[PDB]
Structure formats: C-alpha cells, structure tokens
Design a protein around this motif. Structure first.
Motif, PDB file in Angstrom:
ATOM      1  N   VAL A 139       0.858  -1.156   0.000  1.00 13.77           N
ATOM      2  CA  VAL A 139       0.000   0.000   0.000  1.00 13.77           C
ATOM      3  C   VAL A 139       0.911   1.228   0.000  1.00 13.77           C
ATOM      4  CG1 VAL A 139      -1.427   1.353   1.640  1.00 13.77           C
ATOM      5  CG2 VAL A 139      -2.210  -0.914   0.848  1.00 13.77           C
ATOM      6  N   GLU A 140       2.075   1.111   0.633  1.00 15.91           N
ATOM      7  CA  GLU A 140       2.970   2.259   0.690  1.00 15.91           C
ATOM      8  C   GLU A 140       3.522   2.608  -0.672  1.00 15.91           C
ATOM      9  OE1 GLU A 140       5.672   1.641   3.840  1.00 15.91           O
ATOM     10  OE2 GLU A 140       4.334   2.561   5.348  1.00 15.91           O
ATOM     11  N   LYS A 141       3.787   1.588  -1.481  1.00 16.46           N
ATOM     12  CA  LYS A 141       4.298   1.744  -2.835  1.00 16.46           C
ATOM     13  C   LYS A 141       3.267   2.328  -3.749  1.00 16.46           C
ATOM     14  CE  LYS A 141       7.820  -1.039  -5.177  1.00 16.46           C
ATOM     15  NZ  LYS A 141       7.563  -0.496  -6.542  1.00 16.46           N
ATOM     16  N   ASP A 174       3.105   5.790  -5.618  1.00 15.24           N
ATOM     17  CA  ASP A 174       2.998   5.795  -7.073  1.00 15.24           C
ATOM     18  C   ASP A 174       2.401   7.082  -7.678  1.00 15.24           C
ATOM     19  OD1 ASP A 174       3.187   3.390  -9.395  1.00 15.24           O
ATOM     20  OD2 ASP A 174       1.896   5.070  -9.909  1.00 15.24           O
ATOM     21  N   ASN A 175       3.242   7.755  -8.452  1.00 13.85           N
ATOM     22  CA  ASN A 175       2.941   8.955  -9.223  1.00 13.85           C
ATOM     23  C   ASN A 175       1.910   8.866 -10.370  1.00 13.85           C
ATOM     24  OD1 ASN A 175       4.096  11.510 -11.045  1.00 13.85           O
ATOM     25  ND2 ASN A 175       4.056   9.551 -12.202  1.00 13.85           N
ATOM     26  N   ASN A 176       1.593   7.679 -10.905  1.00 13.90           N
ATOM     27  CA  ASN A 176       0.587   7.591 -11.984  1.00 13.90           C
ATOM     28  C   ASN A 176      -0.798   8.128 -11.555  1.00 13.90           C
ATOM     29  OD1 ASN A 176      -1.205   6.885 -14.178  1.00 13.90           O
ATOM     30  ND2 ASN A 176       0.312   5.407 -14.895  1.00 13.90           N
ATOM     31  N   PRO A 177      -1.401   8.997 -12.387  1.00 14.39           N
ATOM     32  CA  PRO A 177      -2.703   9.534 -11.965  1.00 14.39           C
ATOM     33  C   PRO A 177      -3.815   8.495 -12.087  1.00 14.39           C
ATOM     34  CG  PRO A 177      -2.034  10.441 -14.109  1.00 14.39           C
ATOM     35  CD  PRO A 177      -0.850   9.691 -13.568  1.00 14.39           C
ATOM     36  N   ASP A 178      -3.648   7.582 -13.046  1.00 13.08           N
ATOM     37  CA  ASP A 178      -4.598   6.520 -13.336  1.00 13.08           C
ATOM     38  C   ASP A 178      -4.378   5.195 -12.554  1.00 13.08           C
ATOM     39  OD1 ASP A 178      -4.810   7.981 -16.545  1.00 13.08           O
ATOM     40  OD2 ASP A 178      -6.541   7.592 -15.230  1.00 13.08           O
ATOM     41  N   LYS A 179      -3.679   5.301 -11.425  1.00  9.67           N
ATOM     42  CA  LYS A 179      -3.281   4.159 -10.639  1.00  9.67           C
ATOM     43  C   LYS A 179      -4.431   3.377 -10.022  1.00  9.67           C
ATOM     44  CE  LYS A 179      -2.139   6.624  -6.317  1.00  9.67           C
ATOM     45  NZ  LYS A 179      -0.944   6.897  -5.494  1.00  9.67           N
ATOM     46  N   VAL A 180      -4.260   2.083  -9.928  1.00 12.04           N
ATOM     47  CA  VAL A 180      -5.325   1.217  -9.505  1.00 12.04           C
ATOM     48  C   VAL A 180      -4.743   0.180  -8.562  1.00 12.04           C
ATOM     49  CG1 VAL A 180      -7.024  -0.446 -10.211  1.00 12.04           C
ATOM     50  CG2 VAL A 180      -6.729   1.528 -11.542  1.00 12.04           C
ATOM     51  N   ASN A 181      -5.361   0.047  -7.404  1.00  8.50           N
ATOM     52  CA  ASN A 181      -4.866  -0.924  -6.439  1.00  8.50           C
ATOM     53  C   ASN A 181      -5.652  -2.244  -6.467  1.00  8.50           C
ATOM     54  OD1 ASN A 181      -3.296  -2.090  -4.366  1.00  8.50           O
ATOM     55  ND2 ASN A 181      -4.168  -0.781  -2.735  1.00  8.50           N
ATOM     56  N   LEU A 182      -5.229  -3.226  -7.264  1.00  6.65           N
ATOM     57  CA  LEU A 182      -5.791  -4.595  -7.163  1.00  6.65           C
ATOM     58  C   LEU A 182      -5.040  -5.553  -6.191  1.00  6.65           C
ATOM     59  CD1 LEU A 182      -6.392  -5.148 -10.905  1.00  6.65           C
ATOM     60  CD2 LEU A 182      -7.833  -3.847  -9.284  1.00  6.65           C
ATOM     61  N   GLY A 183      -4.256  -5.004  -5.272  1.00  8.74           N
ATOM     62  CA  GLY A 183      -3.407  -5.800  -4.424  1.00  8.74           C
ATOM     63  C   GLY A 183      -3.939  -6.113  -3.034  1.00  8.74           C
ATOM     64  N   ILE A 184      -4.708  -5.207  -2.434  1.00  8.69           N
ATOM     65  CA  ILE A 184      -5.299  -5.415  -1.099  1.00  8.69           C
ATOM     66  C   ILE A 184      -6.392  -6.489  -1.021  1.00  8.69           C
ATOM     67  CG2 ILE A 184      -4.877  -3.511   0.472  1.00  8.69           C
ATOM     68  CD1 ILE A 184      -7.674  -3.445  -2.295  1.00  8.69           C
ATOM     69  N   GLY A 185      -6.522  -7.121   0.156  1.00  9.24           N
ATOM     70  CA  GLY A 185      -7.438  -8.238   0.381  1.00  9.24           C
ATOM     71  C   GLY A 185      -8.700  -7.782   1.077  1.00  9.24           C
ATOM     72  N   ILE A 186      -9.533  -6.968   0.388  1.00 12.21           N
ATOM     73  CA  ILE A 186     -10.580  -6.111   1.013  1.00 12.21           C
ATOM     74  C   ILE A 186     -11.741  -5.744   0.038  1.00 12.21           C
ATOM     75  CG2 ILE A 186     -10.607  -3.557   1.701  1.00 12.21           C
ATOM     76  CD1 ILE A 186      -8.177  -4.664   3.589  1.00 12.21           C
ATOM     77  N   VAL A 240       3.174  -8.824 -14.549  1.00 16.51           N
ATOM     78  CA  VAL A 240       2.635  -8.168 -13.386  1.00 16.51           C
ATOM     79  C   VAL A 240       3.494  -6.972 -13.065  1.00 16.51           C
ATOM     80  CG1 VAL A 240       2.740  -8.340 -10.888  1.00 16.51           C
ATOM     81  CG2 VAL A 240       1.420 -10.037 -12.239  1.00 16.51           C
ATOM     82  N   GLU A 241       4.791  -7.128 -13.305  1.00 17.71           N
ATOM     83  CA  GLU A 241       5.714  -6.035 -13.094  1.00 17.71           C
ATOM     84  C   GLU A 241       5.439  -4.869 -14.084  1.00 17.71           C
ATOM     85  OE1 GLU A 241       7.201  -4.854 -10.940  1.00 17.71           O
ATOM     86  OE2 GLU A 241       8.436  -3.367 -11.975  1.00 17.71           O
ATOM     87  N   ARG A 242       5.168  -5.224 -15.336  1.00 17.74           N
ATOM     88  CA  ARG A 242       4.935  -4.269 -16.408  1.00 17.74           C
ATOM     89  C   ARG A 242       3.607  -3.459 -16.211  1.00 17.74           C
ATOM     90  NH1 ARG A 242       4.711  -3.862 -21.730  1.00 17.74           N
ATOM     91  NH2 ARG A 242       3.856  -5.819 -22.540  1.00 17.74           N
ATOM     92  N   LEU A 243       2.573  -4.108 -15.683  1.00 17.56           N
ATOM     93  CA  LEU A 243       1.355  -3.390 -15.271  1.00 17.56           C
ATOM     94  C   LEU A 243       1.669  -2.290 -14.283  1.00 17.56           C
ATOM     95  CD1 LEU A 243      -0.697  -6.517 -14.412  1.00 17.56           C
ATOM     96  CD2 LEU A 243      -1.453  -4.906 -16.141  1.00 17.56           C
ATOM     97  N   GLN A 244       2.578  -2.569 -13.364  1.00 17.52           N
ATOM     98  CA  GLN A 244       2.875  -1.651 -12.313  1.00 17.52           C
ATOM     99  C   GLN A 244       3.768  -0.549 -12.856  1.00 17.52           C
ATOM    100  OE1 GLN A 244       5.209  -1.506  -8.263  1.00 17.52           O
ATOM    101  NE2 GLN A 244       4.299  -3.556  -8.538  1.00 17.52           N
ATOM    102  N   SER A 245       4.788  -0.925 -13.596  1.00 20.96           N
ATOM    103  CA  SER A 245       5.707   0.105 -14.004  1.00 20.96           C
ATOM    104  C   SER A 245       5.218   0.927 -15.164  1.00 20.96           C
ATOM    105  CB  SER A 245       7.088  -0.448 -14.275  1.00 20.96           C
ATOM    106  OG  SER A 245       6.938  -1.617 -15.022  1.00 20.96           O
ATOM    107  N   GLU A 246       4.475   0.313 -16.064  1.00 20.84           N
ATOM    108  CA  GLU A 246       3.908   1.042 -17.180  1.00 20.84           C
ATOM    109  C   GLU A 246       2.541   1.747 -16.959  1.00 20.84           C
ATOM    110  OE1 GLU A 246       3.752   0.441 -21.429  1.00 20.84           O
ATOM    111  OE2 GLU A 246       4.569  -1.554 -21.012  1.00 20.84           O
ATOM    112  N   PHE A 247       1.665   1.282 -16.049  1.00 20.69           N
ATOM    113  CA  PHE A 247       0.273   1.801 -15.919  1.00 20.69           C
ATOM    114  C   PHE A 247      -0.234   2.038 -14.498  1.00 20.69           C
ATOM    115  CE2 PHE A 247       0.409  -1.047 -19.484  1.00 20.69           C
ATOM    116  CZ  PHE A 247      -0.384  -0.483 -20.465  1.00 20.69           C
TER     117      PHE A 247
END
Ligand SMILES: Cc1[nH+]cc(COP(=O)(O)O)c(/C=N/[C@@H](CC(=O)O)C(=O)O)c1O
Ligand SMILES: *Cc1c(COP(=O)(O)O)cnc(C)c1O
Ligand SMILES: [Mg+2]
Lengths: 398, 398
Positions: A17-19, A23-35, A358-365
C-alpha cells in the motif's frame, strides 16, 4: 539486550500500500489489497450493521467481560450460518463453538488445541494459500507442509495429485481446506470433487480444518457451506474457523467463530471447556462491541435478511466485474482462453499473468497486483475497468 | 475422536457468581469478582467514555483493519500514562509499544516474545498472584515458579525471603511484578523496598515484567508507576503489560498495551518488529472499537483531564469503604489490629479470614468471597457496608 533479535520479515501488504500510495501515476489502480470495495471504490458500511450499531449506542451500556466463549447468540449465529438453521447436529448439541478474534483468532485457537491434544499432527495447507495460515500454525509448533492445488499449467486444480497426496497422510493429520472462494487463486472444487476429497479424508482418518472467510461471496450462503455440511453428514471430526471480516465489512471489529464438531454430547463438553481454557491463556475473552454486532445481525431475522441481500449485492458486483473483464480480453485476444476468470469465485483471482507482466502493469500503468498473479476483483469498478482491461491487453499480447 | 481430552475445570470464580446468583438470601452481597462498582453497586460507564462513543457513532464509519500494533494514538496514551508525558524515554524513541487485547493479550504477547527469544528463561510470579499469570506464561511453554511474597503471620510482605529467593535466580530469568495494587492481596511494596528489589534485579541481571492493571487506584497515576519509571531510570530491560479494563471501565472492549524498554533505537525497531509479527500469528490486529475509545479519551486533553478525575473518584470511594470497614471492626473487636485493611491498596483485600470463616460468611450470611480470603472492596458501598461489616465481626469470635 535485544541485538540478538532479527528484524521481522515485514508487512508485504503495507509495503504494497505504501508503494501504491507513493505511485505517481494519476490513473493508478490498487488490485493488491485483500478487502471489499464497492462500485465507488470505497469500503462499504452495511445497512444492517448500521442499524445494529445504532442499537448498541442506545443506550450506551456498562461493559462487562464477555464469557470466554463469546456471546450466546454470536456463538449460535456462526453455528446456524455454517450448519443451516436448526441443523440436526445443532439440535443434538454436537458442535462446540466459540466467538473469536476474527478468522485469525479462530485459526489460532483451533491450531493451539490441535497442538495440545494431537501433538503428532502435521498440517497441510494448499499451494498456494493465504500465508497467514502457515505463520499461525507454525506459531504453535505444528509442522506445516503444503498439498498440491493450483495447476499453474492450466489455471485449474491438479486434482489427481492432490488426492493421491492425501492418500500418503497419517491418522489425525490436518488439512486446512477452503470450502469456497479460494485465497489467492479464486479456484474452487466442484461438488463431485468435494465428495471425492471427503471420502479420502474419511478413509485415512484425517482432520479437515475448513477456513471459510468469504461465505456468500461464492454461490450463495447455503451453497458455499456445502463442504462443511457434507463433512458433518459424513461423521468427520470437522474444524471450522469462520470470519465476518469481509461479509460484514467489519475487519477491524475482529469478529469470527471456531466450530468443532464432535461424536457425542460428552466429547462436545470436553472440547468446549478446552476451547475455553485456550482462549483464557491467550486473551481471556473477546471484544464486546463486535460480538454485539454479530449477535444482533444474525439473530434478528429482519436484519439477517437485509444482511444476506447486501452480501449478494457484493457477490454479484464481483461477478459482473469478472464477466466485464473477460469480454474485453476475448474481444482483443481472439485466440485465447479466458474462462477461468468467470469460473473462479470469491474476491480473488489468479489472472495467470507472469511475474514479469505483473511487473509491467505496475511500471507502465500504475496497476498493483501480487506477483503470483493475484488480483482483488473487488478493486475493480466501472471508473477503472477499461483502464485496467486495456492495460492488461497491452502486457498480454507482446 | 476426543475421548482422551480433559474436562476443563472452569474459571474458578465464575461458577461462584453462579452460586451467589443461586443464593436465596435478601441481603446477599457479591465481593468475589474483580469489577469496579459505583456507590449504587452498579457497573458504570465513564462520563468521558460516554462522550467518546458518541463520537464513534457519529458518523458510523467504515471498519478497516487497525495496524498490527493498534492505533498510533492508543499506543501513545499507554506510553504517556505509564512513563510520563513527554518522558525522556519516549523522546529518545526507546520504547516498543503495541495495543493489545486486554492486559491479558499483553501478558500473552510478551510471554511469547520471551519464549521465542530467550528460550531458557524461567518465569517467577508472586505467591500468590492472579491465576491467569501462570496460565498464560505456562501456555507458551515457559516454566513458571513462585517467589515468596505475602506473609500469613503478619499480613505483610515476606521481604527478606523474597530478595533471598531472587538471589538464587539466573541471568534473564523473568519476574512478574505488580508495580502497585497487588492481586489478590492488596499488599504493596514501599519505595525503598522497590529500589531494593530493582537493585537485586540489576545485580543478578534479571528481566522485570511489570503487570499493571489498576493504575490510579492505589495512590495516583504517577506514584502507581513509580517502579516502572525507576526501572527505566535504572536502565533495566523492562516489559510492561498494562490494562484499561478497570480504569476505563471497558472490560468488555479488550483494551491494553504491551511496552518493552530497549537500549538503542535500533533495538526498539527489532523488538517492535517482533511484536507485530507476534500479533500477526495470534489474531492479526486488535479491535477497532475499544481502540478508538482509548485513542480518543487519551489524547483529548479535556476528556483526558476529565477521565483522570473519574479514576481518582474511584480511588477515593474504595478508600472510604476501606476506612469504614475498619471503623466498624476496630470499634467492635477491641484488641486485634486491622490496619492492614487500609495498609492495603487497590480493588482487592486479603481479609485473613480462614476458609472456615469464609464458608460461614456465605453459608450463614450470603456474602460472597474467595476461599483464600480475597474480597473485592469496590463490591462494597454505603448500602451494604453495614451489613457485611457485621457478618465479619460475627464470624470472627467463633
Ligand atoms: C493483575 C492483572 N493483570 C492482568 C489482568 C488482565 O485483565 P484484562 O481484562 O485483560 O485487562 C487482570 C484482570 N483481572 C480481572 C480478572 C479476570 O480478568 O478474570 C479481575 O479484575 O479479577 C489482572 O488482575
Ligand atoms: C481475510 C481472511 C481471514 C481473515 O480473518 P480475520 O482474522 O477475520 O481477518 C481468514 N482466513 C482467510 C482464508 C482469509 O482470506
Ligand atoms: Mg507454543
């Protein structure tokens, strides 16, 4: 004093969540949390919880210790929910039940109990599983192994190898099973498969320990519990840890249950006192507030009916985010098989992306998932579904 | 399956609540349980606690997980209360502190940490102590013994026997100590006795585990923390489990804290790290509701200031029942001395009745106490002191 103490493994999730937060992307999306987030992307407060909580605040009451077992009604609420309203096994009083500090606390107590009385048992968890499974059983000095589950080659259960692996197991060894809505994979057994598995657990005299944390996120309340109710019907020494975290939006209030299904009223008496003694040497008695909420919602038929409907709303909202995702992928990767996305259930999905994608989703989008390919389907809603979907298309084609 | 599991004897006092509850007598009184009652014999809800929960209910807010360590605010209130506002030790960053599920959860987490990290340490508790101390430390596989404490001859400390016993112990052996308000006896060390203990604890390199549940109930907040602060100034590696059950009258909500004092910032981070890890594998994270009450009262200066008045009120009312009981008794049995009833501090008093005298008090009067002579003074109030005081004068010329 303490320089011998190693720095902890660390929180994999808060580092995540800290990362994301960073994250500077304006269109960022968090699919990582268990919630569970709703279609506005926020944590919901349920309407029935809201009423229960209004009752608790009127009047604000004196606050005695709850019994070590938790509230009578809370206890009953887990039982009816798990074994069916007025279930035979409940009438005969064959189930020992305690309220617990979440699913986690129920895992902890069951494990501590199985450690005291069956110190010879190894525990197997599925591969993969929620890592807190392992840290909790290892935390008691149980030997933890894993059994063969997710077939990374197909997106399916490697059912054969799994079964055959149970065949190698000892009297009283413990299987930590997910009755529905697998975490991390979303990959579920069928009924006819549960029927197979269970005959194996019967034949080798093993302990099924079912950890049900998404009841109703699956098919429906009654159906999600099929494994549990079958196991009962079969005379298995069933353990059930259950959680209200997700399906009441009450994560913080730590409400949960542990159930142990015994042979005879006398064994029920034995197990129950022992569940009590175990709670006593851990934390003494469970928190009142959460306990009253579970008590009120489960036992007030009108609020219960309201509750169930909100739960199905989430179940359905997930199913749509699920189908809406596959349609965009098939539309644009004409050859490929995406059925597993809607064949999956619960809040999670192994997307079958490679660690690299999965890495490319994060670094690119700006799209955060776990590297085993787990995504939280609830993280998705209509304001982000196209952005995620097309982003996945870019990474998947290349 | 479970024929081999033992009956659990039960929490010894709660079956006694059942027997008093059973008792037919008009003039029944219950002085056995450890709950604070007001001048009307009722469990109160603190005026500041009222305000807090009013805030929690408005708005009803989503219920996410608290961090493993609990609310940063809860954590601070524990720290400030125990070591003093902006204390040297707090500024320097040297105390690792987590919110816990009661004091009991503090003892538990502490105990486990000792077990994982100092596996050859034995635990010593007062003869006698609150039963759960042993049950908890024994439950983590630590070997528990007793240090000589209460003296039946005098109703005082066996101070000499105690230090003498201490002297025989090993490096990193753990001492479970009540910094004030000892349970069950009410009988306390003096300051000079404290410095002396700490000295021995220093020269023999032992670990003080200070278990403080009645802060404010003895003399005042600061004085009650004297041993804790002194040990701090002494540079000992102190563990402190503290509970808010009695002094926020929040028993049911399960709010405590565990603090460990370390030499270096680096050590704080390691230890604190182990603590979250330890919480993770027992229950994941503590209850939001209780946690908000502690956060709110503790850090709102007006409520905080209110709250303290409320404790001292409670401290005073017990001191009055204390003096009143002695007046009645000293006035009516002229020769023997009762100074102990007011030489004692906090909620409990060891009355010195024999089990013969104790039984008879129940059997002939319906006044309910523990067989070891432990009474809870807060169970007394102006409506029954006069009744109870005489049942005692009576049972004593037998
Ligand atoms: C010395 C002491 N330490 C820790 C605790 C743990 O309390 P918690 O509620 O976890 O903060 C208690 C509780 N004593 C109560 C007994 C009980 O819980 O059965 C009592 O007042 O007797 C103690 O008396
Ligand atoms: C989230 C989760 C739990 C949660 O239990 P709590 O302790 O109530 O948060 C338990 N088991 C599984 C498999 C989970 O995914
Ligand atoms: Mg252990």
């Amino acid at each position: 004093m303490f320089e011998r103490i190693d720095y902890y493994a660390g929180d994999p999730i808060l580092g995540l969540v800290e990362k994301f937060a960073a994250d500077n992307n304006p269109d960022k999306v968090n699919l990582g949390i268990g919630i569970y987030y709703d279609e506005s992307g926020v944590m919901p407060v349920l309407d029935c919880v809201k009423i229960a909580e209004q009752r608790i605040a009127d009047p604000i009451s004196p606050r005695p210790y709850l019994p070590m077992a938790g509230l009578p009604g809370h206890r009953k609420g887990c039982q009816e929910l798990l074994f069916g309203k007025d279930a035979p096994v409940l009438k005969d009083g064959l189930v020992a039940t305690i309220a617990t500090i979440g699913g986690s606390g129920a895992l902890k107590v069951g494990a501590e109990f199985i450690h005291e009385w069956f110190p010879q048992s190894k525990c197997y968890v599925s591969d993969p599983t929620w890592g807190n499974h392992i840290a909790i059983f290892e935390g008691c000095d149980i030997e933890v192994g894993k059994y063969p589950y997710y077939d990374t080659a197909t997106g399916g259960i490697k059912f054969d190898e799994m079964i055959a692996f149970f065949e190698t197991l000892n009297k009283d060894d413990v299987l930590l099973l997910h009755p529905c809505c697998h975490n991390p994979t979303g990959v579920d057994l069928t009924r006819e498969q549960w029927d197979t598995v269970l005959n194996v657990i019967q034949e080798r005299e093993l302990i099924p320990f079912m950890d049900i944390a998404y009841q109703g996120f699956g098919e429906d309340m009654d159906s999600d519990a099929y494994a549990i109710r079958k196991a009962v019907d079969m005379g298995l020494p069933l353990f059930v840890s259950n959680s209200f975290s997700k399906n009441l939006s009450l994560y913080g209030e730590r409400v949960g249950g542990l159930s142990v299904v015994c042979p005879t009223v006398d064994e029920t008496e034995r197990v129950f006192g022992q569940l009590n003694s175990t709670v006593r040497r851990i934390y003494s008695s469970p928190p009142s507030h959460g306990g009253r909420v579970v008590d009120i919602v489960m036992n007030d038929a009108a609020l219960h009916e309201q509750w169930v409907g909100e739960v199905y709303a989430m179940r359905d909202r997930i199913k749509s985010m699920r189908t809406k995702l596959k349609s965009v992928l098939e539309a644009k990767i004409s050859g490929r098989n995406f059925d597993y996305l809607t064949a999956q259930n619960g809040m999670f999905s192994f997307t079958g992306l490679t660690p690299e994608q999965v890495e490319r989703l994060q670094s690119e989008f700006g799209i955060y998932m776990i590297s085993n390919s787990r995504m939280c389907v609830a993280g998705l809603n209509s304001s982000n579904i196209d952005y995620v979907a097309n982003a996945m298309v870019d990474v998947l084609k290349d």
